[PDB]
């Protein structure tokens, strides 16, 4: 009983974090096998960040200019290359703590854990979602770049995010581990604005299922709806449109609870139109959208790693 915003256990990723310094800039790197991955903006001065030419800046850099430290211990850099917006630093030692891993590019609405790091050392772990506008709402200060986001499946870490940027509005932008930004963002200190941050409808529904499984049932009503009728209301409240693909993914929660997905949609429609009237669901006064249907099943069934 109870339902919490839960992060994956961080130990497998803690063993991969290193410090990368180029000139006067220090941030974090990810050490997997004999490669260290980090944001390419490690090479930029404060002048440089305003309008950087990364290919031209990288000409003036050699292997020995990239200082990589794993705990108390210096790694030897034997190659470097740029892939999109990340640098790959080849080192002479394979990380002995390298977990089974994959690089995945996630979809908007997918969740992941962030291990926020400074100087190659972990500060804390929390759960994030990739927003529909391809930002994340993190907790990141200067020096946090190269911190990563991940999911675990038993013993295999799927890395999906590396932190690069804070926008002027205080939301966060970054890349997959191939160095491709999520969304239209660029690694330059220029005004970039995010688009509409819509609510992840399929995740809200999953969390309403989690609420029913935990005895918070006050919001269940006498109504049903259709995908087209629900979606007219979703559009008005800046919710993502629900598709049959989303209905299919919610099937196991529907089967466990005996509440038809379109019935839960009609409960959600009423909460949008009426508000919460000062009541809470699973200790929240807002509809929570950073749990996926997979997250709710995992937490409600006690899946381990």
Q: Which residues are catalytic?
A: 41, 145
Q: Which of 217, 195, 201, 173 is nearest to 289 (CA)?
A: 201
- Residue count, binding to a second copy (CB under 8 A): 54
Given Na ion, ligand 35J, a second copy, none, residue 110, with its beta carbon under 5 to 8 Å by kind, binds none
Q: Does 150 bind Na ion (CB under 5 A)?
A: no
Rounded CA-CA distance 84/155 in Å is 29
116 forms bridges with which residues in the sheet? 124
Token pair, residue 51, equals: 């309008």
Rounded CA-CA distance 149/248 in Å is 27
Rounded CA-CA distance 269/25 in Å is 49
Q: How far is CA 26 from the centre of its chain?
A: 22
Token pair, residue 200, equals: 């992840």
Instruction: Select from 34-42, 59-67, 75-83, 109-117 the region that touches a second copy (CB under 8 A).
Output: 109-117
DSSP state of 164: E
Q: Does 130 bind ligand 35J (CB under 6 A)?
A: no
Neighbour count for residue 184 (Cβ, 10 Å): 11
Question: Can you give the length of the chain in residues?
Answer: 305
Token pair, residue 221, equals: 């009503």
Q: Which letter, b or e, does each residue of 53-79 get, where b requires 16 or more Cβ atoms within 10 Å of its Cβ? A: ebeebeeebeeeebebbbeeeebebee
Given ligand 35J, a second copy, Na ion, none, residue 27, with its beta carbon under 5 to 8 Å by kind, binds ligand 35J
Given a second copy, ligand 35J, Na ion, none, residue 203, with its beta carbon under 5 to 8 Å by kind, binds Na ion
Q: Which of 192, 162, 142, 165 is nearest to 86 (CA)?
A: 162
* The binder of a second copy chosen from 71, 96, 215, 258 (CB under 8 A): 215
Q: One symbol per residue from 60 to 99: x for binding a second copy (CB under 8 A), - otherwise; what is it?
A: ----------------------------------------
Q: Does 117 bind Na ion (CB under 5 A)?
A: yes
Q: In the complex, what is the shortest distance from the CB of residue 195 to a second copy, in angstroms, rounded to a whole number?
A: 18
Q: Does 49 bind a second copy (CB under 8 A)?
A: no
Q: In the complex, what is the shortest distance from the CB of residue 126 to ligand 35J, in angstroms, rounded to a whole number?
A: 14
Q: Does 203 bind Na ion (CB under 5 A)?
A: yes
Q: Which of 88, 83, 93, 98 is nearest to 32 (CA)?
A: 98
Q: Does 176 bind Na ion (CB under 5 A)?
A: no
Q: Which of 189, 188, 208, 198 is nearest to 281 (CA)?
A: 208
* The binder of ligand 35J chosen from 59, 73, 141, 255 (CB under 6 A): 141
* The binder of ligand 35J chosen from 110, 144, 175, 292 (CB under 6 A): 144
* The binder of ligand 35J chosen from 32, 68, 87, 145 (CB under 6 A): 145
Q: Does 147 bind Na ion (CB under 5 A)?
A: yes
Contacts with Na ion, residue ranges (CB under 5 A): 115, 117, 134, 147-148, 173, 182-183, 203, 207, 288-289, 291
Contacts with ligand 35J, residue ranges (CB under 6 A): 27, 140-145, 165-166
């Amino acid at each position: 009983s109870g339902f919490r915003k839960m992060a994956f256990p961080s130990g497998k990723v803690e063993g991969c974090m290193v410090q990368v310094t180029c000139g006067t800039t220090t941030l974090n790197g990810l050490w997997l096998d004999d490669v260290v991955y980090c944001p390419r903006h490690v090479i930029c001065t404060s002048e440089d960040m305003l309008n950087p030419n990364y290919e031209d800046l990288l000409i003036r850099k050699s292997n020995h200019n990239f200082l990589v430290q794993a705990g108390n211990v210096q790694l030897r850099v034997i190659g470097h290359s740029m892939q999109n917006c990340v640098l790959k630093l080849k080192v002479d030692t394979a990380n002995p703590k390298t977990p089974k891993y994959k690089f995945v590019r996630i979809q908007p609405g997918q969740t992941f854990s962030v291990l926020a790091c400074y100087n190659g050392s972990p500060s804390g772990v929390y759960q994030c979602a990739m927003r529909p506008n391809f930002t994340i709402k993190g907790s990141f200060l200067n020096g946090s770049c190269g911190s990563v986001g991940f999911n675990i499946d038993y013993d295999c870490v799927s890395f999906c995010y590396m932190h690069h940027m804070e926008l002027p509005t205080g939301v966060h932008a970054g890349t997959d581990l191939e160095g491709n930004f999520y969304g239209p963002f660029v690694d330059r200190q220029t005004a970039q604005a995010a688009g509409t941050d819509t609510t992840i409808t399929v995740n809200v529904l999953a969390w309403l299922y989690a609420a029913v499984i935990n005895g918070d049932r006050w919001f269940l009503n006498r109504f049903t709806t259709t995908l087209n009728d629900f979606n007219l209301v979703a559009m008005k409240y800046n919710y993502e449109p629900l598709t049959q693909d989303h209905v299919d993914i919610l099937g196991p929660l529907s089967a466990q609870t005996g509440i038809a997905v379109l019935d839960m949609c009609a409960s959600l429609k009423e909460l949008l139109q009426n508000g919460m009237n000062g009541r809470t669901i699973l200790g929240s006064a807002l509809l929570e959208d950073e749990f996926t249907p997979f997250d709710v099943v995992r937490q409600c069934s006690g899946v381990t790693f």
